[PDB]
Design an enzyme around this catalytic site. Structure first.
Site, PDB file in Angstrom:
ATOM      1  N   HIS D  52     -14.019  37.027  62.326  1.00 60.21           N
ATOM      2  CA  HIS D  52     -13.938  38.514  62.266  1.00 60.21           C
ATOM      3  C   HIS D  52     -12.659  38.978  61.604  1.00 60.21           C
ATOM      4  CE1 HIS D  52     -17.221  38.360  65.171  1.00 60.21           C
ATOM      5  NE2 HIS D  52     -16.464  37.611  65.955  1.00 60.21           N
ATOM      6  N   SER D  75     -15.251  36.646  57.117  1.00 57.39           N
ATOM      7  CA  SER D  75     -15.631  37.043  58.490  1.00 57.39           C
ATOM      8  C   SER D  75     -16.788  36.208  59.061  1.00 57.39           C
ATOM      9  CB  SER D  75     -16.005  38.537  58.470  1.00 57.39           C
ATOM     10  OG  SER D  75     -16.036  39.034  59.796  1.00 57.39           O
ATOM     11  N   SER D  80     -18.145  43.091  61.323  1.00 54.14           N
ATOM     12  CA  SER D  80     -16.950  43.092  62.157  1.00 54.14           C
ATOM     13  C   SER D  80     -15.680  43.257  61.354  1.00 54.14           C
ATOM     14  CB  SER D  80     -16.875  41.840  63.005  1.00 54.14           C
ATOM     15  OG  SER D  80     -16.764  40.694  62.188  1.00 54.14           O
ATOM     16  N   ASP D 128     -15.289  30.543  64.254  1.00 51.23           N
ATOM     17  CA  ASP D 128     -15.647  31.372  65.382  1.00 51.23           C
ATOM     18  C   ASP D 128     -17.174  31.478  65.355  1.00 51.23           C
ATOM     19  OD1 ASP D 128     -16.283  33.552  67.108  1.00 51.23           O
ATOM     20  OD2 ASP D 128     -14.466  34.598  66.504  1.00 51.23           O
ATOM     21  N   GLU D 153     -13.179  29.061  68.190  1.00 47.34           N
ATOM     22  CA  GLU D 153     -12.727  30.224  68.951  1.00 47.34           C
ATOM     23  C   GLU D 153     -13.586  30.518  70.174  1.00 47.34           C
ATOM     24  OE1 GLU D 153     -10.092  32.151  68.451  1.00 47.34           O
ATOM     25  OE2 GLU D 153     -10.450  34.086  69.369  1.00 47.34           O
ATOM     26  N   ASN D 178     -11.734  27.995  72.866  1.00 51.82           N
ATOM     27  CA  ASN D 178     -12.271  28.981  73.787  1.00 51.82           C
ATOM     28  C   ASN D 178     -11.872  28.650  75.211  1.00 51.82           C
ATOM     29  OD1 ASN D 178     -14.959  29.634  75.732  1.00 51.82           O
ATOM     30  ND2 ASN D 178     -14.317  31.251  74.340  1.00 51.82           N
ATOM     31  N   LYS D 183      -7.227  31.518  76.695  1.00 57.73           N
ATOM     32  CA  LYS D 183      -8.269  32.197  75.919  1.00 57.73           C
ATOM     33  C   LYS D 183      -9.412  32.702  76.841  1.00 57.73           C
ATOM     34  CE  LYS D 183     -11.475  33.225  72.764  1.00 57.73           C
ATOM     35  NZ  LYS D 183     -12.971  33.447  73.044  1.00 57.73           N
ATOM     36  N   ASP D 187      -9.028  36.733  76.896  1.00 55.13           N
ATOM     37  CA  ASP D 187      -9.796  37.325  75.799  1.00 55.13           C
ATOM     38  C   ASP D 187     -11.211  37.697  76.292  1.00 55.13           C
ATOM     39  OD1 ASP D 187     -11.883  37.007  73.754  1.00 55.13           O
ATOM     40  OD2 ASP D 187     -10.293  36.486  72.315  1.00 55.13           O
ATOM     41  N   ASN D 188     -11.958  36.703  76.782  1.00 54.28           N
ATOM     42  CA  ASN D 188     -13.384  36.904  77.110  1.00 54.28           C
ATOM     43  C   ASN D 188     -13.520  37.956  78.254  1.00 54.28           C
ATOM     44  OD1 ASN D 188     -14.991  33.718  76.287  1.00 54.28           O
ATOM     45  ND2 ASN D 188     -12.923  34.375  75.766  1.00 54.28           N
ATOM     46  N   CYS D 192     -12.974  42.033  76.712  1.00 53.78           N
ATOM     47  CA  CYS D 192     -14.229  42.760  76.789  1.00 53.78           C
ATOM     48  C   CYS D 192     -14.145  43.951  77.759  1.00 53.78           C
ATOM     49  CB  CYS D 192     -15.365  41.832  77.219  1.00 53.78           C
ATOM     50  SG  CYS D 192     -15.799  40.677  75.910  1.00 53.78           S
ATOM     51  N   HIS D 298     -22.062  36.389  70.921  1.00 55.51           N
ATOM     52  CA  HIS D 298     -21.674  36.109  69.559  1.00 55.51           C
ATOM     53  C   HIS D 298     -22.750  36.382  68.513  1.00 55.51           C
ATOM     54  CE1 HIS D 298     -19.395  34.495  66.253  1.00 55.51           C
ATOM     55  NE2 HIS D 298     -20.502  33.869  65.882  1.00 55.51           N
ATOM     56  N   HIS D 350     -11.267  43.480  70.436  1.00 58.60           N
ATOM     57  CA  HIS D 350     -10.270  43.461  71.535  1.00 58.60           C
ATOM     58  C   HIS D 350      -8.970  43.941  70.957  1.00 58.60           C
ATOM     59  CE1 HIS D 350     -12.482  39.778  73.492  1.00 58.60           C
ATOM     60  NE2 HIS D 350     -13.167  40.903  73.541  1.00 58.60           N
ATOM     61  N   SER D 358      -5.362  34.357  72.293  1.00 59.19           N
ATOM     62  CA  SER D 358      -6.364  33.544  71.579  1.00 59.19           C
ATOM     63  C   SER D 358      -5.842  32.897  70.324  1.00 59.19           C
ATOM     64  CB  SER D 358      -7.576  34.445  71.245  1.00 59.19           C
ATOM     65  OG  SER D 358      -8.023  34.999  72.466  1.00 59.19           O
ATOM     66  N   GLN D 362      -5.019  29.223  68.640  1.00 57.91           N
ATOM     67  CA  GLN D 362      -5.510  28.778  67.322  1.00 57.91           C
ATOM     68  C   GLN D 362      -4.405  28.142  66.499  1.00 57.91           C
ATOM     69  OE1 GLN D 362      -9.815  29.609  67.073  1.00 57.91           O
ATOM     70  NE2 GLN D 362      -8.293  28.209  66.186  1.00 57.91           N
TER      71      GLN D 362
END
Ligand SMILES: NC(=O)c1ccc[n+]([C@@H]2O[C@H](COP(=O)([O-])OP(=O)(O)OC[C@H]3O[C@@H](n4cnc5c(N)ncnc54)[C@H](O)[C@@H]3O)[C@@H](O)[C@H]2O)c1
Ligand SMILES: NC(=O)c1ccc[n+]([C@@H]2O[C@H](COP(=O)([O-])OP(=O)(O)OC[C@H]3O[C@@H](n4cnc5c(N)ncnc54)[C@H](O)[C@@H]3O)[C@@H](O)[C@H]2O)c1
Ligand SMILES: NC(=O)c1ccc[n+]([C@@H]2O[C@H](COP(=O)([O-])OP(=O)(O)OC[C@H]3O[C@@H](n4cnc5c(N)ncnc54)[C@H](O)[C@@H]3O)[C@@H](O)[C@H]2O)c1
Ligand SMILES: NC(=O)c1ccc[n+]([C@@H]2O[C@H](COP(=O)([O-])OP(=O)(O)OC[C@H]3O[C@@H](n4cnc5c(N)ncnc54)[C@H](O)[C@@H]3O)[C@@H](O)[C@H]2O)c1
Ligand SMILES: Nc1ncnc2c1ncn2[C@@H]1C[C@H](CO)C(=O)[C@H]1O
Ligand SMILES: Nc1ncnc2c1ncn2[C@@H]1C[C@H](CO)C(=O)[C@H]1O
Ligand SMILES: Nc1ncnc2c1ncn2[C@@H]1C[C@H](CO)C(=O)[C@H]1O
Ligand SMILES: Nc1ncnc2c1ncn2[C@@H]1C[C@H](CO)C(=O)[C@H]1O
Ligand code: NA
Ligand code: NA
Ligand code: NA
Ligand code: NA
Lengths: 430, 429, 430, 429
Positions: D52, D75, D80, D128, D153, D178, D183, D187-188, D192, D298, D350, D358, D362
């Site tokens: 993204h 992307s 996105s 990702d 990711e 992930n 992460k 992140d998740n 969200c 996803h 996010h 995240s 990486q």
């Protein structure tokens, strides 16, 4: 020729006193009233009959009234709500108190009767919670009414009765509605119940709240507090309501709002907060999940049809004091708390002391208002001025280490209010 | 031999009524009975249990018995027994040696009563915090080869198991029950979320709303504690050593700082770390008047209670397990349960429903070790995920949850057995 | 000789209409007003000048007033709040609207001026939000006052001004206080802001809320909503307050309550809700964390000293419309939203339509009350009756699938109220 | 060769201002720059990124460049990209092939543009959801031996990696980013919790309070989604296949039932499962009028969008990525982003702070694979816990968190290195 007091066990007084010392330190509003008025004694000459749950917090109230010059005689306004150690401490200090946990209806009425006559004469002030003392005097002792300077009344059900009495021309004494002080109704009824409802349920049953469906009847200040408490521990809360405004508030907070006729099929815990008759009936009981817990937090035990359970169950098993498990003809069980009496005081210790200091500082202010300024208060039902209501709140800020902002003269000019308040119009709802 | 020793056998009838209520809240345990009472998988097992002797534990005990085990039981804390529950178990004929308010000598004597059965010594250990495990290894090593397995309930006890194995001193296979998903993420979290407040309220009746509450540790226990306090309107400050947990707390809106700073602000202190030396004299000396101090970690090592006893100018007992100290500075400290875990010491511990998750894991672990010892070499093991999922599934009916089933097309899409396990081994939930 | 309307781009009308269709279906109170009164046309003869944020929701209000028989001419009450597609849809339907996003102060006043004169004569009703139209007519066009039957006023700041005008003998037209309908102040100001504050902050900055310290000045209905929103996403929320009652409510909800003089050292996000001057000053800006985000949700842009930033910063970098990043002499940066104008409408789309249906159904009821029953309303400031307030709530229950309980005759007798309400005493605070 | 392809290079100046703001919210990435810009650990790396193309990803890209890598980027979703961010990266001279609103053909063409550098083909993958990984394995297998590593990711992408390895078809070592704690649990979850509502609001401006919202899945994504909706006053109903997740949801006070039932009640639907066939025609036909339906998984496989296109009687485009369908029954359905992940498709994904967790993972994974390939045989690996803890620690300063340090006595008591790691490998946080 009469008992000087009547309590469960005067030997509990030392333990009561320790609980009182701790409570004093959580009740800065009441302690401030003592500090301000202990020397001037504004309540000198007052002979106060109190009828209010004889708890640790009520004991700190009583001693404040006494420090302020009043003579006091006390009873509890519920048969199950007295804390015997608090009652014993009051009795030990020489104050006539007639109260114990687990009175019969007959003992209850006898206790109120002991509070009516002082050495110097009959009561000249009433401090009431629910109206039983107020009603007793108007109905049974009308000859005593012209001797009474004023009534202060603690709770929603009691103030409802005062409005009714006034509109029927039956009220003969000036009254202050303490329930509807902002610092009472929006604190005690709300945050008080948010803590003490779950306390009563837990001490009675030890039930897990998380995962359950809880049904709360009424979404007024008490129902709002109870709902928040239950959902905080992971119950899914359903609300019943008759008032479309309160119903819409609940739905906007994420609760399902439906009727008891539907909710009775789903609830694992049932809490009644309405102040109204006929909330949980036999038709609801017959549909409840096995071991549904059913309790009331409204003032009087009129919400739950306990008589239905007593008449229709196959058997009633007492589990421990104030906890009964009924076995119905459908083979399922209902757990009933405190025989439908207010569960926070009946099964636990009622609201914690800090919030009761808001309510009871209002009570002391009301008693001072009525006793020392009787001509501000004609026969009728009155509120305390907003400036005093604000003062009650301000008295509790230091204990919580709150720092309140002061308006500058320029801001106060801009808002068109005094730097010392009051800061809100009389219709403000907080 | 003594059939049992309890505070008051007269409490048996009340205990039994509390057990009846708890059974109906414990569908995992009741299911283990319905499935296994006939086949008796635990026939020949002689289980010594060292675990808080509560109503919940009584339902666990009678489940083990229904499954064919012989059991002898003691508590793992001097203050956590519920005398009515111990009386019900004694009245049922099960050897239990437990009462609320034991001395240290009585505590050890009680554990010692659980080692010998009519047919031989113990051959299974069910432990909470490792006192029974450690006693056998250090004082009764001649009993070690006769023990088929250990199952361990709690974080502190499993830490000890891993340390023993790493040092080559563990001599019996163990199952880490704490780290079943359905234990650690339920009992430690949602259990404490209700029972911490219960303990504080029964002890002190204090208002939570408007207070600052300091929670040391933001593990599964501290997460549940912190949520509970915040729910009632406390402003909660967290302390942590682990940067991950500390970042979690900050992302939930809690101030994270050191105890060195937080001791100046808290009105209520709760230790959840499992670690020594959390609240010290230097902290007590800075606290707000009538600060309430308590621990919910397994061992009473987090709070320097000795400091208060030695340095306070007054010490007043308010009621059982509640002491008010007056310090040289004029201010007061309220200490709960002499630093022992406050939920079980001042209230009733976790409610029955969530304990059914923990204790269903215990029964499964006892069956695994007793009937499949060869799957478990000396070492520390987890229960299989399929069994962990089965524990959760057994509790769904009581809550009227409707679980979705994957279609064959979705199971094929996900590369997943249609009937689970549904998550990889590293999944954190 | 005058423009029939003035909007950004009439070509946006088709897109505006699609947004209106969706909004209608979220506004059952307004649609019910159309359904009940479209045929009888109670507002026949009314010539309403409206001055209120020209949004999608205001467009549904306008079309309701028109369906009810009114002639309407409209302007926005804020230079940044108009939604150009909504304005275009209104213009396309033949309704005179003078509004676009990003007006200058001069254009703003010109727009209000276009609403004063209708083909048949001058305005005879005012629908206002903040008092600018009310004030303009009283100060600049006093000759038009005797032709105006009534004023309804949307917001707290506007109603404050009406009370002030009345107590100074300056108010010359009867007014209804719509802000203080229960179904407005306890819904729009609270739940409305709980959603639209974060929407404005996010669309402007995309900042993470979780982990931040957020400072909310004021804990009235707006501050309560804003605080809850921020804490829900994991911000640590600090509150400032001048009123000890509101301050005590915040502390009882678990917020730190302190002064802006202290909070300015800690906040990463600053939201002003007070309705008061001089809330965030240069002394506060100089102490703020790097990239502190500062915004206002009160009606007028008087809370934040934006002039200080403009005069004292080393530079101002415009990031995009309504988002400015100032570089101070201390090397740190401040992000200022909407030049201190109300951020929910200036940087996002204001409150969602469902809650605006509560506010605007009150507005329609007020307009009907004033226009058709002028003699119920002497020169003064008035509330709508509780029965109408309850009706507004009841009108929104079906859309949320709420099931409201009906009292039995026996319960209504017991509570001493009518089965159809009103269900609360006039002082009830909900 | 084409230097880049973006919607509008003219957006570069605005993009850069958004990057400047995001840098200040991304201390983990800025720290990786301060530590490694001089030593250039990624010198010689030719990284193809498929992720993204947002403001956050731009800060990641320029971090990789600062560390010495050559990078070419596309992307991982057609909707996105944030065109101003892609413009800033293009203007900086980095080959990026991404714009909001790609066709399927353009999407593949863009990934294909990232494979070849001036000095040779790619030698590192940053992915990702696995499209780049799968493209290389299936269509460019001759490039496989030239690739030193993959870092992945997202949950769906790591599921694919594990499946490929189990089938012996993975040919390059991979790091599962992930499932770094910092992460998956940040992140998740918290990502969200803010960006789902953002997407729904920008698209529809709908009131959340008072609605019923149905969230399919209660993983890390569905947990954050569910909390977000409930916070604004929606009543949230959960669907789940996993009895553990389902019991978690019930213990948080959510009704858990099937979509077959929930479709009759929801006003807002959010799919979080990563699974095909979640919301079908039979569900659409039962929904309340103007039900809002969206996905945050996803891939756009959860919602039967084809059903709506084929069976609706009317289809009205309200604005970009927002369609209102009129069904035969007279009722309407509002579909967001044609079923594509709604937070990035209808809003900005996010916020930067959590993406810094995240993306610091990486960068670390790229350094690990590039500079220590021998630690990573073909297979799927986690980053070491010490590095995961280091990611959290790098974000504590920005939030003014004060982390406690163990004393030597406490570290010895806990049997723990004083400087961590502080938790065992199985710890779930
Ligand atoms: N136990 C305690 O500590 C405590 C504390 C404060 C008040 N009270 C008592 O609690 C009760 C409620 O007090 P409150 O302040 O919340 O009053 P309230 O008027 O604010 O709320 C009662 C609610 O019940 C609703 N209601 C009435 N009949 C109903 C019915 N048949 N079904 C569903 N809802 C119905 C009303 O619409 C109202 O909103 C009163 O009896 C009061 O005296 C108890
Ligand atoms: N009372 C109960 O009913 C009950 C229930 C479950 C577990 N427990 C016990 O509770 C304790 C905690 O269990 P857990 O599952 O939460 O463990 P955990 O490992 O999940 O959490 C403990 C946390 O404490 C933090 N910590 C360690 N030392 C610290 C220090 N000096 N200061 C601040 N933080 C520090 C660690 O970083 C860790 O995050 C253990 O002793 C366990 O056995 C008690
Ligand atoms: N943007 C919007 O959608 C929206 C919606 C509704 C209301 N409003 C506006 O929001 C503002 C507030 O409305 P409200 O209904 O919350 O009013 P309110 O009177 O209920 O609350 C304002 C609070 O600010 C406090 N305050 C005043 N001066 C202060 C100071 N110097 N520092 C700290 N606190 C101070 C007061 O004590 C009061 O509690 C008004 O301007 C109103 O018109 C905006
Ligand atoms: N949009 C974003 O910014 C973003 C962020 C992170 C992850 N993701 C994506 O989100 C999705 C979910 O990620 P996660 O980390 O939550 O995964 P997860 O594995 O933690 O959770 C998914 C859950 O869905 C449940 N589930 C599977 N099939 C189901 C069905 N048919 N019905 C109901 N529940 C079912 C599973 O039991 C599991 O609990 C993945 O596709 C992931 O790549 C998106
Ligand atoms: N601890 C307590 N002591 C005394 N009164 C208490 C306590 N808790 C709650 N109340 C009263 C109960 C009553 C309903 O009768 C009210 O309105 C509350 O103020
Ligand atoms: N009611 C209860 N009965 C028995 N055990 C309980 C109870 N509540 C909590 N626990 C244990 C306490 C222990 C730490 O020693 C744990 O890990 C929890 O599982
Ligand atoms: N979408 C919206 N359309 C129109 N008016 C809105 C919107 N959202 C909020 N309001 C007004 C703003 C105003 C302060 O001026 C109030 O009191 C709210 O009712
Ligand atoms: N702003 C953002 N920039 C870049 N990536 C983002 C953003 N928000 C979320 N993500 C990704 C989306 C992806 C599922 O494909 C994940 O797992 C998250 O890490
Ligand atoms: Na008390
Ligand atoms: Na129990
Ligand atoms: Na809108
Ligand atoms: Na961003």
């Amino acid at each position: 020729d009469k008992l000087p007091y009547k309590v469960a066990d005067i030997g509990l007084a030392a333990w009561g006193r320790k609980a009182l010392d701790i409570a004093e330190n959580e009740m800065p509003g009441l302690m401030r009233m003592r500090e301000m008025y202990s020397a001037s004694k504004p309540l000198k000459g007052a002979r106060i009959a109190g009828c209010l749950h004889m708890t640790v917090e009520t004991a700190v109230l009583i001693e404040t009234l006494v420090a302020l010059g009043a003579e006091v005689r006390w009873s509890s306004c519920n048969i199950f709500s007295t804390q015997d150690h608090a009652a014993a401490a009051i009795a030990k200090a020489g104050i006539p108190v007639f109260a114990w946990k687990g009175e019969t209806d007959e003992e209850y009425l006898w206790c109120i009767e002991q509070t009516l006559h002082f050495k110097d004469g009959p009561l000249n002030m009433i401090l009431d919670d629910g109206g039983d003392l107020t009603n007793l005097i108007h109905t049974k002792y009308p000859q005593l009414l012209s001797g009474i300077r004023g009534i202060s009344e603690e709770t929603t059900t009691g103030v409802h009765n005062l409005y009714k009495m006034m509109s029927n021309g039956i009220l003969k004494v000036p009254a202050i509605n303490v329930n509807d002080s902002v610092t009472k109704s929006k604190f005690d009824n709300l945050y008080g119940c948010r803590e003490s409802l779950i306390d009563g349920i837990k001490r009675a049953t030890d039930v897990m709240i998380a995962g359950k469906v809880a049904v709360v009847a009424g979404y007024g200040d008490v129902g709002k507090g109870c709902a928040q408490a239950l959902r905080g521990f992971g119950a899914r809360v359903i609300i019943t309501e008759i008032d479309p405004i309160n119903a819409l508030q609940a739905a906007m907070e994420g609760y399902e709002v439906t009727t008891m006729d539907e909710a009775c099929k789903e609830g694992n815990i049932f809490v009644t907060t309405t102040g109204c008759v006929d909330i949980i009936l036999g038709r609801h009981f017959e549909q409840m999940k096995d071991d549904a817990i059913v309790c009331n937090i409204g003032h009087f035990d009129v919400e739950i049809d306990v008589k239905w359970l007593n008449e229709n169950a196959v058997e009633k098993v007492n589990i421990k004091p104030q906890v009964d498990r009924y076995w119905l003809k459908n083979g399922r069980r209902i757990i009933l708390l405190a025989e439908g009496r207010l569960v926070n005081l009946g099964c636990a210790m009622g609201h914690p002391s800090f919030v009761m200091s808001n309510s009871f500082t209002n009570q002391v202010m009301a008693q001072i208002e009525l006793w020392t300024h009787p001509d501000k208060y004609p026969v009728g039902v009155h509120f305390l001025p907003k400036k005093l209501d604000e003062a009650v709140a301000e008295a509790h800020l230091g204990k919580l280490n709150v720092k309140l902002t002061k308006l500058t003269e320029k801001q106060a000019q801009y808002l068109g209010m005094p730097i010392n308040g009051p800061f809100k119009p009389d219709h403000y709802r907080y």
